[PDB]
Amino acid sequence: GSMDFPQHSQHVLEQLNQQRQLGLLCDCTFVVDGVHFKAHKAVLAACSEYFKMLFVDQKDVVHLDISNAAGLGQVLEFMYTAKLSLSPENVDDVLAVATFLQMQDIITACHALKSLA
Amino acid sequence: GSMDFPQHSQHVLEQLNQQRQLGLLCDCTFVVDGVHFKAHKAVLAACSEYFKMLFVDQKDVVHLDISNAAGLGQVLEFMYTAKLSLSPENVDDVLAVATFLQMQDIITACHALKSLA
Numbered sequence: 352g353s354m355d356f357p358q359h360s361q362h363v364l365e366q367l368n369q370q371r372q373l374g375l376l377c378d379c380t381f382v383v384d385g386v387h388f389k390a391h392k393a394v395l396a397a398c399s400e401y402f403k404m405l406f407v408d409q410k411d412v413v414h415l416d417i418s419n420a421a422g423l424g425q426v427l428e429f430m431y432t433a434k435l436s437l438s439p440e441n442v443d444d445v446l447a448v449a450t451f452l453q454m455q456d457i458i459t460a461c462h463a464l465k466s467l468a
Numbered sequence: 469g470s471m472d473f474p475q476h477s478q479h480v481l482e483q484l485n486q487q488r489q490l491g492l493l494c495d496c497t498f499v500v501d502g503v504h505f506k507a508h509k510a511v512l513a514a515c516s517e518y519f520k521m522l523f524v525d526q527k528d529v530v531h532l533d534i535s536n537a538a539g540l541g542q543v544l545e546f547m548y549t550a551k552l553s554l555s556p557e558n559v560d561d562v563l564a565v566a567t568f569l570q571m572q573d574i575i576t577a578c579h580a581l582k583s584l585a
């Protein structure tokens with residue numbers, strides 16, 4: 352029937368991050384404050400409806416350059432690590448951009464932390 | 469600082485499998501008994517050192533067509549879902565091929581079913 356799905360997905364993700372840090376099989380460039388960072392098209396799409404829509408047919412969606420977004424640097428790291436780097440100064444910014452990106456794990460993570468503070 | 473959100477792994481692989489279902493951002497074809505199944509190079513590479521190696525330099529990997537390997541029809545589904553159909557009758561074919569593919573998760577599964585004895 353099945354094996355352990357949370358354990359398996361973890362190993363797969365940890366492997367996709369290792370591929371990234373080595374430029375291995377990366378097929379796009381994710382821009383952050385002007386800076387290029389290699390990434391897997393499939394993974395950005397897996398994380399965000401916005402990126403999904405962008406590779407399928409970009410002409411059809413909102414032309415918003417989020418390259419300079421406050422919190423965006425934290426969002427790319429999360430995608431591949433499932434680790435979020437929040438601080439009292441950056442919670443709102445990360446939340447705002449993840450809400451735009453439609454990334455629910457981060458939305459509820461930030462909401463969770465905000466509720467405690 | 470850093471907070472772990474491990475459910476996000478399950479989100480990435482679930483969506484990667486959704487992408488495979490709808491024919492999206494797949495860049496390679498996994499062959500079983502001559503049959504073409506669409507997949508992501510990055511997912512296959514993440515799960516198997518054999519596949520990782522095959523997309524890097526196909527010309528200097530052993531010249532063995534494993535399309536007809538007994539148990540290979542078990543592998544692709546597992547990579548995306550962790551779903552696995554082991555049985556007394558098929559454990560060894562799966563193990564044998566899981567070994568060639570360097571897949572520890574599937575090897576461990578096979579050994580566990582074989583322990584019922």
Ligand SMILES: [Zn+2]
Nearest residue numbers: 358359362573
């Ligand atoms: Zn696994």
Ligand SMILES: [Zn+2]
Nearest residue numbers: 382385386387
């Ligand atoms: Zn640039």
Ligand SMILES: [Zn+2]
Nearest residue numbers: 408409410411
């Ligand atoms: Zn269109």
Ligand SMILES: [Zn+2]
Nearest residue numbers: 438439440441
């Ligand atoms: Zn600071």
Ligand SMILES: [Zn+2]
Nearest residue numbers: 456476479480
């Ligand atoms: Zn997520």
Ligand SMILES: [Zn+2]
Nearest residue numbers: 499502503504
């Ligand atoms: Zn063929």
